[PDB]
Amino acid sequence: PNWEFARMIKEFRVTMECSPLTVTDPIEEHRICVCVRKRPLNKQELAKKEIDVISVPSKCLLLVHEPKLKVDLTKYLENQAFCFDFAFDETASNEVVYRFTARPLVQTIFEGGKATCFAYGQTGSGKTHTMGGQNASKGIYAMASRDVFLLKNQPRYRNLNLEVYVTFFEIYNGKVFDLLNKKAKLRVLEDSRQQVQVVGLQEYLVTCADDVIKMINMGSACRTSGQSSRSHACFQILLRTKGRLHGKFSLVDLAGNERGADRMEGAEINKSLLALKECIRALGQNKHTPFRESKLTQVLRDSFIGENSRTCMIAMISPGISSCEYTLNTLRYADRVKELS
Ligand SMILES: Nc1ncnc2c1ncn2[C@@H]1O[C@H](COP(=O)(O)OP(=O)(O)O)[C@@H](O)[C@H]1O
Numbered sequence: 220p221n222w223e224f225a226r227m228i229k230e231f232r233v234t235m236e237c238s239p240l241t242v243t244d245p246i247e248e249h250r251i252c253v254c255v256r257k258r259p260l261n262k263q264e265l266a267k268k269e270i271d272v273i274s275v276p277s278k279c280l281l282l283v284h285e286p287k288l289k290v291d292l293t294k295y296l297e298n299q300a301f302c303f304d305f306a307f308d309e310t311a312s313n314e315v316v317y318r319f320t321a322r323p324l325v326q327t328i329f330e331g332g333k334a335t336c337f338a339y340g341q342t343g344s345g346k347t348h349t350m351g352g353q354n355a356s357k358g359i360y361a362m363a364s365r366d367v368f369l370l371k372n373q374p375r376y377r378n379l380n381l382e383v384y385v386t387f388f389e390i391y392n393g394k395v396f397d398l399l400n401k402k403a404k405l406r407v408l409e410d411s412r413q414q415v416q417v418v419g420l421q422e423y424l425v426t427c428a429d430d431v432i433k434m435i436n437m438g439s440a441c442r443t444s445g446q447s448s449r450s451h452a453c454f455q456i457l458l459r460t461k462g463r464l465h466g467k468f469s470l471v472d473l474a475g476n477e478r479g480a481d482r483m484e485g486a487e488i489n490k491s492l493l494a495l496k497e498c499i500r501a502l503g504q505n506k507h508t509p510f511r512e513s514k515l516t517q518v519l520r521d522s523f524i525g526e527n528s529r530t531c532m533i534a535m536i537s538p539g540i541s542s543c544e545y546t547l548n549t550l551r552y553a554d555r556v557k558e559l560s
Pocket residue numbers: 257258259261340341342343344345346347348349448535
């Protein structure tokens with residue numbers, strides 16, 4: 220009679236009663252990981268006496284303390300619960316976030332796989348802080364790379380004779396721009412073999428964590444260079460052997476999810492994120508493609524269609540009261556993503 224409700228509940232209950240061993244366990248595929256990270260209220264927000272309306276009372280639970288008025292003007296809270304594979308609170312460092320989000324996926328590229336990790340959320344919520352880090356080394360791009368190098372110099376993987384390359388680009392108004400090559404506008408193509416090639420995208424050999432941080436810092440400066448969440452940034456790590464691609468980790472600082480204004484680049488952003496949602500779900504459901512395509516999902520197409528492909532989504536949350544409607548929007552996107560599995 221009410222199976223659907225029962226099932227949603229089962230899924231809720233299962234995602235609560237879970238440890239860190241489930242995602243980090245190999246010996247069982249965990250193709251889709253979804254997390255949430257609350258950032259702290261900052262100085263400017265405290266300066267406007269903004270209320271913090273988020274709590275993270277467990278490693279799996281996030282609470283939104285939604286402020287409400289009764290019809291008669293009586294104030295009250297609607298305390299709404301959301302569960303995720305992991306839930307990081309206002310104290311969690313980038314290193315802690317990295318350890319349970321992307322770090323597990325590193326190994327996937329070494330096993331000939333394609334990985335993807337997405338920072339998703341409203342503008343000002345911590346997407347770039349998480350992935351990019353002025354200081355690249357405090358980010359996930361850097362940390363992923365650090366660990367990619369350690370895996371390379373392990374016994375298990377020395378035999379493979381692997382060279383590490385990196386790419387770094389920005390997707391803005393459906394055009395791709397190479398950030399390791401002075402914002403060079405590139406041309407995206409569908410090969411008659413149905414597969415996507417970014418023409419002119421510079422890959423650059425790297426030998427060393429610090430090399431990579433050098434490249435990230437350069438690409439970052441090239442992004443700004445003037446005067447983000449206007450556009451998507453994607454930083455890839457490629458393992459090649461004989462020029463032949465072994466595996467690939469694409470790490471993406473998405474664009475601001477907040478679009479219902481009506482400068483209707485916000486339409487492009489919306490179709491991207493809807494498409495991304497469908498591609499992520501397509502993943503677990505070897506299933507044809509994002510359905511109203513976007514570049515983002517063109518360029519990243521290979522990293523979902525694969526049989527040996529993992530992904531991880533990190534919903535970012537601004538804890539302020541004035542962000543509450545955005546927060547609830549971020550969380551509901553995330554809900555539906557995790558909904559597969
Ligand atoms: N987890 C965090 N801890 C401390 N400060 C943060 C955190 N997340 C974001 N910030 C602050 O927010 C700004 C970073 O931009 P960010 O919010 O990451 O971009 P985006 O709007 O793409 O999410 C900086 O002022 C940074 O110090």
